[PDB]
Design a binder for this molecule. Structure first.
Ligand SMILES: O=c1cc(-c2ccccc2)nc2c(-c3ccccc3)c(C(F)(F)F)[nH]n12
Length: 274
Protein backbone atom coordinates (compact mmCIF):
# COMPACT_ATOMS: atom_id res chain seq x y z
CA UNK A 1 0.00 0.00 0.00
CA UNK A 2 1.22 3.49 -0.93
CA UNK A 3 1.08 6.61 1.22
CA UNK A 4 -1.60 9.06 0.06
CA UNK A 5 -0.47 12.64 -0.58
CA UNK A 6 -3.11 15.37 -0.78
CA UNK A 7 -3.48 17.15 -4.10
CA UNK A 8 -3.60 20.32 -2.01
CA UNK A 9 -0.06 19.61 -0.81
CA UNK A 10 1.41 19.13 -4.33
CA UNK A 11 2.34 21.84 -6.86
CA UNK A 12 3.30 20.76 -10.40
CA UNK A 13 6.05 22.75 -12.10
CA UNK A 14 8.24 22.18 -15.11
CA UNK A 15 8.04 19.22 -17.45
CA UNK A 16 11.30 17.30 -17.33
CA UNK A 17 10.53 14.79 -20.10
CA UNK A 18 8.66 11.59 -20.84
CA UNK A 19 8.74 7.90 -20.07
CA UNK A 20 6.88 5.11 -21.78
CA UNK A 21 3.26 6.37 -21.69
CA UNK A 22 4.21 8.85 -18.96
CA UNK A 23 5.05 12.49 -18.41
CA UNK A 24 7.66 13.56 -15.85
CA UNK A 25 7.44 16.84 -13.88
CA UNK A 26 9.35 18.58 -11.14
CA UNK A 27 7.13 19.71 -8.30
CA UNK A 28 6.93 20.76 -4.67
CA UNK A 29 5.32 18.90 -1.76
CA UNK A 30 4.26 20.76 1.39
CA UNK A 31 4.77 18.33 4.26
CA UNK A 32 5.22 17.98 8.00
CA UNK A 33 8.77 16.74 8.49
CA UNK A 34 11.09 15.89 11.35
CA UNK A 35 10.32 17.63 14.64
CA UNK A 36 7.04 18.85 13.12
CA UNK A 37 8.73 21.46 10.93
CA UNK A 38 6.94 22.34 7.71
CA UNK A 39 8.99 21.84 4.56
CA UNK A 40 8.44 22.60 0.89
CA UNK A 41 10.18 19.57 -0.61
CA UNK A 42 11.23 19.14 -4.23
CA UNK A 43 9.59 16.02 -5.69
CA UNK A 44 9.63 14.06 -8.94
CA UNK A 45 6.13 13.52 -10.31
CA UNK A 46 5.36 10.76 -12.84
CA UNK A 47 1.96 11.02 -14.52
CA UNK A 48 0.50 8.09 -16.46
CA UNK A 49 -0.97 9.23 -19.78
CA UNK A 50 -4.75 9.40 -19.62
CA UNK A 51 -4.91 7.55 -22.95
CA UNK A 52 -3.05 4.63 -21.34
CA UNK A 53 -5.02 4.03 -18.13
CA UNK A 54 -5.05 0.39 -19.29
CA UNK A 55 -1.48 0.18 -17.92
CA UNK A 56 -2.18 1.69 -14.48
CA UNK A 57 -1.65 -1.59 -12.58
CA UNK A 58 1.82 -2.17 -14.06
CA UNK A 59 2.64 1.54 -13.67
CA UNK A 60 2.01 1.42 -9.92
CA UNK A 61 3.37 -2.11 -9.37
CA UNK A 62 6.71 -0.96 -10.83
CA UNK A 63 7.13 1.57 -8.02
CA UNK A 64 5.41 -0.50 -5.33
CA UNK A 65 7.73 -3.51 -5.66
CA UNK A 66 10.80 -1.32 -5.21
CA UNK A 67 9.21 0.69 -2.38
CA UNK A 68 9.12 -2.40 -0.15
CA UNK A 69 12.94 -2.43 -0.20
CA UNK A 70 15.25 0.20 1.27
CA UNK A 71 18.72 0.79 -0.13
CA UNK A 72 21.07 3.75 -0.47
CA UNK A 73 21.23 3.35 -4.26
CA UNK A 74 17.44 3.11 -4.77
CA UNK A 75 15.20 6.14 -5.32
CA UNK A 76 12.75 6.85 -2.51
CA UNK A 77 9.04 6.70 -3.30
CA UNK A 78 6.94 9.15 -1.27
CA UNK A 79 3.49 7.97 -2.33
CA UNK A 80 0.72 8.49 -4.84
CA UNK A 81 -1.39 11.60 -5.26
CA UNK A 82 -4.56 10.03 -6.72
CA UNK A 83 -5.08 13.65 -7.79
CA UNK A 84 -8.68 13.28 -8.86
CA UNK A 85 -8.83 10.71 -11.65
CA UNK A 86 -5.11 10.97 -12.48
CA UNK A 87 -2.54 8.24 -11.84
CA UNK A 88 0.46 10.00 -10.30
CA UNK A 89 3.56 8.75 -8.49
CA UNK A 90 5.47 11.04 -6.11
CA UNK A 91 9.14 10.21 -5.59
CA UNK A 92 12.42 11.74 -4.52
CA UNK A 93 13.83 14.54 -6.66
CA UNK A 94 17.45 13.72 -7.56
CA UNK A 95 19.34 16.98 -7.93
CA UNK A 96 21.38 16.38 -11.10
CA UNK A 97 18.99 14.16 -13.05
CA UNK A 98 19.51 11.38 -15.54
CA UNK A 99 22.95 9.90 -15.94
CA UNK A 100 22.63 9.60 -19.72
CA UNK A 101 22.11 13.36 -20.16
CA UNK A 102 24.81 14.13 -17.59
CA UNK A 103 27.37 11.94 -19.38
CA UNK A 104 26.74 13.75 -22.66
CA UNK A 105 26.98 17.24 -21.19
CA UNK A 106 30.19 16.44 -19.27
CA UNK A 107 31.82 13.96 -21.65
CA UNK A 108 35.16 15.81 -21.56
CA UNK A 109 35.26 16.16 -17.74
CA UNK A 110 34.55 12.50 -16.89
CA UNK A 111 37.39 9.97 -16.78
CA UNK A 112 37.43 6.20 -16.45
CA UNK A 113 37.68 6.30 -12.65
CA UNK A 114 34.46 8.33 -12.47
CA UNK A 115 32.75 5.79 -14.74
CA UNK A 116 34.18 2.88 -12.74
CA UNK A 117 32.80 4.32 -9.50
CA UNK A 118 29.32 4.78 -10.93
CA UNK A 119 29.44 1.28 -12.42
CA UNK A 120 30.36 -0.14 -9.00
CA UNK A 121 27.44 1.69 -7.41
CA UNK A 122 24.97 0.40 -10.00
CA UNK A 123 26.33 -3.12 -9.53
CA UNK A 124 25.90 -2.75 -5.77
CA UNK A 125 22.24 -1.85 -6.27
CA UNK A 126 21.74 -4.75 -8.68
CA UNK A 127 23.39 -7.20 -6.31
CA UNK A 128 21.03 -6.06 -3.56
CA UNK A 129 18.11 -6.66 -5.94
CA UNK A 130 19.49 -10.08 -6.94
CA UNK A 131 19.91 -11.14 -3.31
CA UNK A 132 16.23 -10.18 -2.87
CA UNK A 133 15.22 -11.97 -6.11
CA UNK A 134 13.61 -8.74 -7.32
CA UNK A 135 13.65 -8.18 -11.09
CA UNK A 136 13.97 -4.56 -12.20
CA UNK A 137 13.53 -5.12 -15.92
CA UNK A 138 14.42 -1.68 -17.24
CA UNK A 139 18.00 -0.89 -16.28
CA UNK A 140 19.33 1.96 -18.45
CA UNK A 141 21.24 5.19 -18.02
CA UNK A 142 18.05 7.28 -18.38
CA UNK A 143 16.80 5.63 -15.17
CA UNK A 144 19.99 6.22 -13.14
CA UNK A 145 19.92 9.56 -11.31
CA UNK A 146 22.89 11.57 -10.01
CA UNK A 147 22.36 12.72 -6.39
CA UNK A 148 25.81 14.29 -6.03
CA UNK A 149 28.66 15.32 -8.29
CA UNK A 150 32.27 14.45 -7.67
CA UNK A 151 33.83 16.82 -5.12
CA UNK A 152 37.62 16.59 -5.43
CA UNK A 153 37.99 19.01 -2.51
CA UNK A 154 36.59 16.49 -0.02
CA UNK A 155 37.42 13.43 -2.14
CA UNK A 156 33.73 12.59 -2.46
CA UNK A 157 32.83 10.53 -5.55
CA UNK A 158 29.64 10.92 -7.58
CA UNK A 159 26.63 9.16 -6.07
CA UNK A 160 23.77 7.63 -8.06
CA UNK A 161 20.37 6.09 -7.42
CA UNK A 162 18.26 3.75 -9.56
CA UNK A 163 14.63 4.71 -10.33
CA UNK A 164 11.79 2.24 -10.90
CA UNK A 165 11.41 0.47 -14.28
CA UNK A 166 8.03 1.91 -15.21
CA UNK A 167 5.47 -0.17 -17.09
CA UNK A 168 6.76 -3.74 -17.43
CA UNK A 169 7.97 -5.18 -20.73
CA UNK A 170 5.70 -8.15 -20.00
CA UNK A 171 2.72 -5.93 -20.98
CA UNK A 172 4.16 -3.36 -23.39
CA UNK A 173 3.52 -3.48 -27.15
CA UNK A 174 6.05 -5.49 -29.13
CA UNK A 175 7.07 -2.41 -31.14
CA UNK A 176 8.19 -0.66 -27.95
CA UNK A 177 10.29 -3.64 -26.87
CA UNK A 178 11.99 -3.74 -30.27
CA UNK A 179 12.71 -0.03 -29.99
CA UNK A 180 14.31 -0.88 -26.61
CA UNK A 181 16.90 -3.17 -28.16
CA UNK A 182 19.68 -3.59 -26.94
CA UNK A 183 18.53 -2.96 -23.39
CA UNK A 184 15.81 -5.61 -23.74
CA UNK A 185 17.65 -8.95 -24.03
CA UNK A 186 17.20 -11.28 -26.99
CA UNK A 187 15.18 -13.85 -25.08
CA UNK A 188 12.64 -11.14 -24.17
CA UNK A 189 12.25 -10.09 -27.79
CA UNK A 190 11.61 -13.79 -28.39
CA UNK A 191 9.05 -13.74 -25.55
CA UNK A 192 8.51 -10.98 -22.95
CA UNK A 193 7.54 -13.66 -20.43
CA UNK A 194 11.23 -14.70 -20.39
CA UNK A 195 11.77 -11.68 -18.12
CA UNK A 196 14.15 -13.04 -15.47
CA UNK A 197 16.89 -11.91 -13.10
CA UNK A 198 19.13 -12.75 -16.05
CA UNK A 199 17.39 -9.90 -17.92
CA UNK A 200 18.95 -7.30 -15.63
CA UNK A 201 22.46 -8.70 -16.13
CA UNK A 202 22.11 -8.16 -19.88
CA UNK A 203 20.63 -4.68 -19.43
CA UNK A 204 23.39 -3.86 -16.97
CA UNK A 205 25.91 -4.54 -19.75
CA UNK A 206 24.09 -2.20 -22.10
CA UNK A 207 24.01 0.46 -19.40
CA UNK A 208 27.74 0.08 -18.78
CA UNK A 209 28.20 0.62 -22.52
CA UNK A 210 26.21 3.86 -22.17
CA UNK A 211 28.39 4.94 -19.22
CA UNK A 212 31.55 4.25 -21.19
CA UNK A 213 30.27 6.00 -24.36
CA UNK A 214 29.65 9.47 -22.95
CA UNK A 215 25.88 9.10 -23.19
CA UNK A 216 25.62 7.71 -26.70
CA UNK A 217 22.77 5.28 -27.31
CA UNK A 218 23.85 1.88 -28.65
CA UNK A 219 22.50 0.95 -32.08
CA UNK A 220 20.63 4.28 -32.28
CA UNK A 221 21.35 4.36 -36.03
CA UNK A 222 19.40 1.10 -36.47
CA UNK A 223 15.65 1.13 -36.97
CA UNK A 224 13.57 -1.52 -35.26
CA UNK A 225 13.81 -4.08 -38.06
CA UNK A 226 17.59 -3.72 -38.13
CA UNK A 227 17.75 -3.99 -34.35
CA UNK A 228 15.99 -7.35 -34.75
CA UNK A 229 18.59 -8.45 -37.32
CA UNK A 230 21.31 -7.38 -34.85
CA UNK A 231 20.00 -10.09 -32.50
CA UNK A 232 19.23 -12.60 -35.28
CA UNK A 233 22.88 -12.46 -36.41
CA UNK A 234 23.99 -12.62 -32.74
CA UNK A 235 26.08 -9.46 -32.88
CA UNK A 236 27.68 -7.75 -29.93
CA UNK A 237 28.06 -4.04 -29.32
CA UNK A 238 31.31 -2.36 -30.36
CA UNK A 239 33.89 -1.75 -27.68
CA UNK A 240 33.43 1.75 -26.22
CA UNK A 241 36.20 4.27 -26.77
CA UNK A 242 36.75 3.84 -23.02
CA UNK A 243 37.33 0.16 -23.73
CA UNK A 244 38.48 -0.82 -20.22
CA UNK A 245 35.04 -2.33 -19.49
CA UNK A 246 34.46 -3.80 -22.97
CA UNK A 247 35.07 -7.37 -21.77
CA UNK A 248 32.71 -6.96 -18.83
CA UNK A 249 30.05 -5.49 -21.14
CA UNK A 250 30.20 -8.47 -23.50
CA UNK A 251 30.27 -11.02 -20.66
CA UNK A 252 27.05 -9.48 -19.26
CA UNK A 253 25.50 -9.30 -22.73
CA UNK A 254 25.68 -13.06 -23.10
CA UNK A 255 23.14 -14.49 -25.53
CA UNK A 256 22.80 -17.46 -23.17
CA UNK A 257 20.93 -16.08 -20.10
CA UNK A 258 22.13 -18.88 -17.81
CA UNK A 259 25.78 -17.91 -18.43
CA UNK A 260 25.50 -14.26 -17.47
CA UNK A 261 27.67 -13.65 -14.37
CA UNK A 262 26.20 -13.01 -10.94
CA UNK A 263 26.38 -9.46 -9.70
CA UNK A 264 28.83 -10.69 -7.04
CA UNK A 265 31.11 -11.83 -9.86
CA UNK A 266 30.48 -8.55 -11.69
CA UNK A 267 31.49 -6.48 -8.63
CA UNK A 268 34.64 -8.58 -8.19
CA UNK A 269 35.62 -7.92 -11.82
CA UNK A 270 34.97 -4.19 -11.48
CA UNK A 271 37.17 -4.21 -8.37
CA UNK A 272 39.87 -6.12 -10.30
CA UNK A 273 40.51 -3.60 -13.09
CA UNK A 274 43.02 -1.87 -10.78
O1 LIG B 1 14.80 13.00 -9.99
C1 LIG B 1 14.88 13.35 -11.14
C2 LIG B 1 15.45 14.55 -11.48
C3 LIG B 1 15.52 14.92 -12.82
C4 LIG B 1 16.11 16.12 -13.23
C5 LIG B 1 15.85 16.62 -14.50
C6 LIG B 1 16.46 17.78 -14.94
C7 LIG B 1 17.34 18.46 -14.12
C8 LIG B 1 17.63 17.95 -12.85
C9 LIG B 1 17.02 16.79 -12.42
N1 LIG B 1 15.07 14.10 -13.76
C10 LIG B 1 14.52 12.91 -13.45
C11 LIG B 1 13.96 11.85 -14.07
C12 LIG B 1 13.84 11.77 -15.48
C13 LIG B 1 13.29 12.85 -16.16
C14 LIG B 1 13.15 12.84 -17.54
C15 LIG B 1 13.56 11.75 -18.28
C16 LIG B 1 14.10 10.66 -17.62
C17 LIG B 1 14.24 10.68 -16.23
C18 LIG B 1 13.61 10.94 -13.14
C19 LIG B 1 12.95 9.57 -13.36
F1 LIG B 1 12.53 9.09 -12.14
F2 LIG B 1 11.91 9.68 -14.25
F3 LIG B 1 13.81 8.65 -13.82
N2 LIG B 1 13.85 11.28 -11.91
N3 LIG B 1 14.46 12.54 -12.11
Amino acid sequence: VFHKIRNEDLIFNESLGQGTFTKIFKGVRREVGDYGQLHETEVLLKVLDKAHRNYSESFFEAASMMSKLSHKHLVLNYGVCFCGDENILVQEFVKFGSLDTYLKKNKNCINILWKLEVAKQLAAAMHFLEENTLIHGNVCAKNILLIREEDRKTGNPPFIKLSDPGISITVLPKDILQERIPWVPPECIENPKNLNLATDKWSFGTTLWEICSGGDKPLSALDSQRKLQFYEDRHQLPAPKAAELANLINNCMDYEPDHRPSFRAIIRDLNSLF
